[model samples]
Target: VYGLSEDEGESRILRVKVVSGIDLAKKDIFGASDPYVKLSLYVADENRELALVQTKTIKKTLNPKWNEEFYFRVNPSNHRLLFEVFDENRLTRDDFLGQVDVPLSHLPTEDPTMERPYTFKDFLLRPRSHKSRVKGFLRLKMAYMPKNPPPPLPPGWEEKVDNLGRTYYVNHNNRTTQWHRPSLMDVSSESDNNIRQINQEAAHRRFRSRRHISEDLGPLPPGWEERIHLDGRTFYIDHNSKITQWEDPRLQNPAITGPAVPYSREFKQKYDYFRKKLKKPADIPNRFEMKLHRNNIFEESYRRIMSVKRPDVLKARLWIEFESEKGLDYGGVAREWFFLLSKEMFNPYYGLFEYSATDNYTLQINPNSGLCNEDHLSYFTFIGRVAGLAVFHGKLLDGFFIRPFYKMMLGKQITLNDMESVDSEYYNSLKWILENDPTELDLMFCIDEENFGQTYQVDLKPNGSEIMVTNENKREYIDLVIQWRFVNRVQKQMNAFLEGFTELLPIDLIKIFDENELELLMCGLGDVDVNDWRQHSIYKNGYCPNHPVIQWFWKAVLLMDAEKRIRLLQFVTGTSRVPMNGFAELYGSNGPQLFTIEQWGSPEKLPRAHTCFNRLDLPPYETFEDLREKLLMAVENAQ
Candidate 1:
C-alpha cells in the first residue's frame, strides 16, 4: 500500500455544472442581457490557463439555463474556484454581472463519478468588489474527485461526506450509513449473485436531481410513512418505532436523532391558540349533569360516565351534585368530584396504579393490574376518560404520574435517564451494569421479578433464559429490559387509555406538546405566587384592597410556608394547583372566575369558603393578630 504514496498529493478532478440563473441583473437598454459564465482557478501570480473554461452565451434573457458541465484538475486543499458572470456584447467590452468565489476546501471530498456524485445547490453570487451591483443568485452543482484511488468500496456500498467534512459509508443494500469501513468478505457468497443488478439500479437512482427526495427518490426507510396535518403541512409517522416527527426520515442523520419536542416558542403559542378553539356549541345543551353520591364518588362517577354517549359527554361541560346534599351544582361540586375520583383511582391499594419508589407521590401503572382487576383494561379506559374530563373542564387532579408515563402519553421513547424519577435503586443497578464488566457478573438476558412470596423469571427475549449476557449484547439487553418494563407490560392498558382519552381530547392536537408541557397543561403550576393571586383577585361586599382585614390576611399568607399557601388556595378554590396561565385564566362553573374576598359573619365565627365562586368569607375581627390566627386555623382545618 505504501508503494503508491507519491500519488497522494497529485491533482484531483473538480467538476462544476452551471445549472441556471435567477433574476440576473440587466446591463443593456432592453431590460435584459446576454449572460454566460467564465470559470478559472485562482492563483497569487494569476498566470495559470491550464484549467480555464467558459460557457456559450445565451441572448436576451435575465434567467438562463446552460446545463453545461466542466471539469478541471487541481489540488482541492490549495485551490480556489472563481466564477465570473458577464453580459456578452458583440460590439464592445462585456459588462460584469457578478462573481462567486468558492474555496475548494468547502467542496465535499466524496469521489465524483457517474454512480454517486456529491452536489451543492443554489449558491448566491456576490460582486467581487464592494459597492458593485449584484442582483441575482446562481444555481450550481460541484464535486471533487480524488486522483489517487482510496480503498475500493464494496459492490453495494457508497462513500459520502457531511458538512463538517467527515467521511461516512452508505450501503444501498440496507439503506444505512456507518462510520466504519466495510469489506466485501463480510457479504455471504449467495448475495454476490444479485449484487450486480442492485448496484446498477442504485446508480441509476442516484444521479437525477432528487428534489423532494422523500417523494421521488425511494420509499422511506423501513416502517415510516407520510402524513398530512390538518393545516396542510406534511409530517411523518413511524409505525414500527412508535414515534412521530415532522422531519422526513430519509433525509435525517441517524446518529444525530433524539427525542422530538417542539423547539420554538411559536409551537407553544400555537398550542395555546388551538386549545381555546375547542368551544362548546350553542345548539347543544350546556350541562352534562353527573348526580354523584358523596360516599361512592368513584363508582357513581364511572357508572354515569359509562351510561352517557361519548359524543354527548364531550359536547357539553360537566355539572355535578352530590346525592342528598343541599348545595346546587355550579362548578365547585364537579371540581370536588375530580379531586375525590383521582384520589380513589390512583390509590396504591387498588393495584391499578402504584406509588413510585421515590418518597414523592408520583404514580405509574402497575404491571400486575390484570391480577387485581379482571377487567383492568376497561378501568384504565375509564380513568383515561376521567383524566380527559379533568383537563377539558379545567379542574385539577389530586395526583401526578411519573415522567415516563407522560412521555408515553406524548408518544415519545423513555430512556435510561427517565428511570431515576420512578425507581432510583433500579436505575443505579442498571447504570452500574453499563459502567462495569457485566460478563464477569454472570448476568443473563432475563429479569427476576418478585410478586408476593413467589419468584419468577421473565425472558427479555425469546429463549432469553438460556442466553448469556456478554459485552457485545449488554446494550441490547438493557434496551429490552427497559422496553419490557415501560412499554410491553402496559401496552394493552395504554391503548385502551388513549382510546378513551382521544374520545374527548384529540391526540393530534396534544402531540405538539412534550411531556413536561403536557404535565403543566394538565396539572397547572404547583407553586402559586401570592402576587399573581392578589393582582387578579376581586373584592366583594364593600371590601376593598385597603381594608385592614385584607391587609392582615395577605401579611399572614406571606408568612405561611409553601404547603400552607397551597392549602389556602385549595381552601378557597377547591384545588391546590393554580391555573397554568396564572390567576387570570382561572376557571369556575360558568367561565373565568377571579379569587374574591367578602366581609361576612362576626368576629366569633370562623372564615368559610364558597369554592364554586372562588370566594373567601372572612370574619371581621378587631385585631391583626386575631385575624391572622383565625385565618391560618380556618385554612388548616379546610376540607
Candidate 2:
C-alpha cells in the first residue's frame, strides 16, 4: 500500500519500521493474550493483501509494546515482512497468535544522526501447537526511498484549519507539498498522472541488467558514447558533458518546434496542469537530465570537509574504510543541532519543537535529518512530551543533551539492544550547552554553511566581570564578540544598512539570510556596540565628513534587540566587514543580556574548499592587524 508491489517494483524504495514485539504466544485459552498486531506489506495472502496495517489490540498483554509501524513499497525483488498475532476471540475466530517471515531484503543503512535501532531479534514464530514454541523480539527499521512515490492524502494535508470549514482538492504549481494515493492496486498506477510511468520507474531503478559481448569485450563504447554515470547523473564519462546536462533538452532538432523553454501555451497548460505528467522524450531530452549530469560529476568526487585530509571511502559496519565519517543517514540529529545551534540558521532542511497550540506546532525535526535518512526522534513525542526542565539562558538544560535516558528521551531502552550503544545514544541526544559549559560559557555565535563560518576571540567584562578574572590587574576588558562575516561579492546589499538599523530595531528578529548566497546571514544581531559612548562622540560630523570607525557604527544600531543591538555598521556582507564586536555580560542572571551561538570556521580553503572559485575569500576588517593579514594570507595562499 505504501510502496513496491506492482509485481514488486524491481527493488528498494522501502520504509518498513514495524518496531516492537516480544514473547507473543498466549492466544486466550481463557486469559492473558488479548495481543494484537497485524503487520503486512506485500504480504498478499489471507485474502489478497499488499497492505494490512494493524496494532491496537493490547488488552491483557503477553509482553507487548507495539512501537508499531508498517510502511512498504519495496522490492529489488525482495518482499516478505509478515507478522500476525491475534487473541480477541469472542464468539470463535480471532485467535492465531504466531507467524513470522520478515527478511524483506538487505537493509543496513543506519545513522540518521546516531539513531541506531534496527533490532531483528529472536524471531522463530510458526509454532502454535505441541504446546506452542513462539518467540518475538522484533525492531525493524529500513529506510531508502526517493523515487517515484505518490499517493495517500486527506485530513486536508495535515490540517491547521482556523476557518473550521473545508472542502478539498487544491493543486497549485509548486504542487509538491503532498500527494498520497498509493494505497496500491492501481489507484491511478501512481498518479501525478503517471509521470512517464514515474520516469520509466526511475530509469529502471537506474540500470543494471547488461551483458555485452564483442567476443569478450574486444570492442566497447558508443551507445551515443555510452556514459552511465553513478548516482549523480547516470554516471558520466562525458559525451558533451553527459549530453549538455542542464536538465538536458538542448534538443532543438527532434522537432520539439516551439515550447518548454521560457514556457507558455498558457505556461504549457500550467505545466501539464501541475507537474508535467510525463511528456519528456523528444528523443530523450532528460534521462533525469542525464541523471543530473552524472550527479555533478559525483559532486566532483564527494567533497564535504572537516578539514580536508580527504580520505573518504566510507561505508562502515566493521568493514569499509578510507574515512571522515560523513557517509549518510543520521536520522535527524536535530538537523545537526539546528545547524549548529542556529548560528543564524541556514543549510538546515527542517527542525521543530513548537508548542503553540490551536496556533498549532506538534511535529518537526525534519531538516533532512542531518542530511536525509530521517527518523530522528520519531517526529513527535520527542522523548515523550519532555517532563519540564529544559531551561537555558537561566540554566539547567544540562549535559546528555536534555537528560531523559531513564525518563526515556535519550537514555535508550525501547527494548535496548546495544547497537553501538544505540549509536552513542542518538548522538548523546544531540549535545550542547556549549558541550557542558567550557569555563562557564565564555562566548559563541558563528556559522558554516560548510565553508563560510568559523571564528574566535572573546574577553568581555565592562564591569559584568568574570572571564577567568584572577583580579584582572585592576579590571578592564570588552571585546565580547562572536563574529562570522563572509563575502565574495558581485551582489547582496543590506537595503542601505537596514535603513539605519531599521530605525532602531523593530522586531522580525532580524534574519536577512541567503541573498543568492556567497554567505550572507545576519541573524539576531544582539551583542553589539561600536561607540560605547566614547569613540569620538559618534564621529563628530562637525566638519560633516565622518569616519571614526564609520561613526561608531551609526551610533551603535540604536543600542540593542534586532536581540540587543549595541549596533554598528559592521557585520557586513558583500565587502565583508564583521564589526559589532562588544557586549557579552551574560553569566547566569536572566535580567536581559545574553548572546549564545556556536561554531564557525573559514580560512584559506582550496582543492576547491570543496569547490566554487577556490574559496576562503573574505574582506572588510580594518584591524586585529587587518584580521591578521587576511588570516596569514589565507594560510599562505593555502599553499
Candidate 3:
C-alpha cells in the first residue's frame, strides 16, 4: 500500500486512509510531476472568508480501502486541522480521503486538575467553522452541571406584602389621626401599657426640655398662649384644613353677632351727633282766608276805598314803590303788606302769604283764601292780578297757578319760562295759531280789540308812573286778559330766550334783534307787506326773498323753533330724542321735521349719545354766526 510514513523509534510506520476506485485528475502532466493527492481543511477566518487550514498530499492508491490510525500532537495554543489523501502514479485514478482536526488540548500534562475551569458565563462563542464544528461534536459527549438555585422565600411574607399594599394607617395618640403607618414601637394597639409609658415619657421629656429653657425664655407675656393657639390650631385649621372646630361663642348664637347698642360714653356722644343730623318736618300753621273774587267791581272799589281810609294800606302801597327793583323783584314790602292784611282785615287768622307785583303796587293774597268770603274778597282780586303779572313775566312760576294749569293740560310740568320747552303738540298748536291763523279761540283768547272788544291803552302820567289795566264790564274779563294776552306774551318771550340760549343763538339785544328782525323778519319783508305778515305760510312755502342776512336770521329762528318743539316733546313724553317718533307725531304734524325731531331723541334714550353726538351729523357751530350759517343751511334744505 502506498501511504505516508513517519519514523517511530527507528521504525517507519505508515499512517493513512484510502478509498478504492479513485479517479485522479492531473492539471500538469509529465513535466517534473510528483504523484500526489491534494487535500484541504475547509475553515473560515475572522471576516468569514472560506480558507484552507492545512493541506497535504500522499502516495496514490487504486481502489484503496485502508484502516490506519494517525495521530497529531497539536500545540495547546494553535487551533487547526489537516486533510490527508493518496494519489495514483501517472494514472487517471486517485483515492478519496477525509480530514482530521487537531485538538488544542491533545498533549497529556502533569495534572489535568490544574487546568482552569471553563466558566462559559464569560466566554463569547463564535459561529460554526471547520474547527468549531469538530469541537461541537466533541462537546456533545461531555456532561454539564448548574449552580445551586436561590433559597425559597420564608413563610407568612404575604402579611408584609399586604402591609405594603395598604394606603392609610391609624394612630391613637391624643385622639389625633395621621397618614403615617405606625411602627411596632409606635403602635398603641400593640401594647396598651407600653403606649401609656411612651406617652408619659414623651410628656416628661417635653416638660424637662421646656423647664431647661424656662429661665432663659422667661414666662410668656399676657395672652401669649392664647395668641399661639389662635395662630396655630384656630387659624391654620380653619383656613387650611377641611375639618375645624368653631371657637367663637358668637358663631353659635347669630343674634349675639349682630350690631351692638351704644354703651360707652364715647359711643353715646357719637349717637347724639348722628341724632342731631336727623330733622323732623315742621308744622306749618294754616294762615289767611281762602276766597275767590266775589265781584270785580266790589273788589276794585273796596281796594280804592281802603287806599283812602287805611293809612297802613297807603303806607304799604308806598313801600311797594321803594321795594320794586327791576324784573320780577317783589321785596319784603309785599310780605309785610300780606302780614298786615292777614292780621287786620282777616282777624283771628295766621297769615301764610304770597304776593306778586302788578304795576307799582304789591297785591298780597292768601293761597288758602276762598273765592266768596267777603272778609278777603278785595285781597283775592288784588292778589289774582299780582299772580297774573307773575305769569305774564314768566318769572318763578313752578308752584304758581297758571303754569301748573298748563302743565296739567300737557300732562307734564310746564314752565312759562319753558314754553318753548312745551310738547310739540302744544308748540305746533301755537305755531299753527300764530302762523296759519287757525281757529284757536277756545284754547287761546286774545286780549286784543278784535276778540275782546277792548284796546291796550298805555296811560302815562307826568310822574313817569304808568298804569296798564283792562277796562271791561266784568272783573273776570280783565282776569282773562291777564291769563291770555299778558301771560302768553311773556311765555313767548321766555320761550324765545330759552331756545336762543340752549341753541347758542345770539343772546345780546343787538344779536337778538338781528336774529328776530334781520333774519326772521326778512321772510315777511320779501314780497310781503310788514302789516300783512303771514308767519307760518312764508316758511311753509320754502321761499326766501329776503336779504341774505335776513334769511340767515329766519333760518336760525326756524331751527330754534323746531328744536324747542322737539325738546318739548321729549320733556312731555319722557322719551329719548332719537326714538321719539311716537312722541313727535303726538306733538307735531307728521313730516321730515318730525323725523329730525325723533332722530335727536333724548340723550337719556341713547347711552352712547355723549360719545357719538358728532356721528349724528349734528350742527358744529361754536359761535352765533357759525350757528346762524348752519341753521340757515338746515332750514333752506328742510323741506
Best by lDDT: 1
Q: Write the per-residue lDDT of candidate 3 for residues 225-338, one digit (tens) a residue.
A: 111133444211111112222333323444233332222111122223222422223332332112222223223434553344312222122223222233332533333333
Give all candidate RMSDs, comma-separated: 31.8, 32.4, 55.6
How do the residues 200-286 of candidate 2 rate in per-residue lDDT, one tens digit apiece? 455332221211111013211221112223455432121212132222232423533332222111111221212222111224212
lDDT of 2 at 313: 13
Give all candidates' CA lDDT scores.
Answer: 0.63, 0.29, 0.27
Which TM-score value belongs to model 3? 0.15
**Order of models, best lDDT first:** 1, 2, 3
Clashes of each: 0, 45, 30
Superposed model 3: Cα runs more than 4 Å off: 1-377, 381-430, 433-619, 622-639
Against the true structure, candidate 2 reaches a TM-score of 0.16
Clashes, model 1: 0
Worst 10 residues of 1 by lDDT: 207-216
Which regions of candidate 2 fall more than 4 Å away from where they truly are?
A: 1-35, 38-177, 181-639
lDDT winner between candidates 2 and 3? 2
Candidate 1 versus truth, CA RMSD in Å, comes to 31.8
What's the lDDT for candidate 3? Answer: 0.27
| Candidate 1 per-residue lDDT over residues 1-639, each given as its tens digit | 112112234666666778888887752222335667888775424535445667765754567877877766566666677788876431111256789987766665455565454344787878764324678788878865555536778778876432111245767664444556975676556776467557545533322211111121744443344555565776665534347677777767563355444322222333344455555544667666667776577777777785666454555777777777878666666656666677567764555776444322346787767875799877787888887876776666666665677778877776776664454434555676688777544667766665786867777678988879878777887787677766787878888888888777767666654454455456554566788778898887877798887888888888887545765775576454454446887765333678889888988889997654568999787888898888877865553
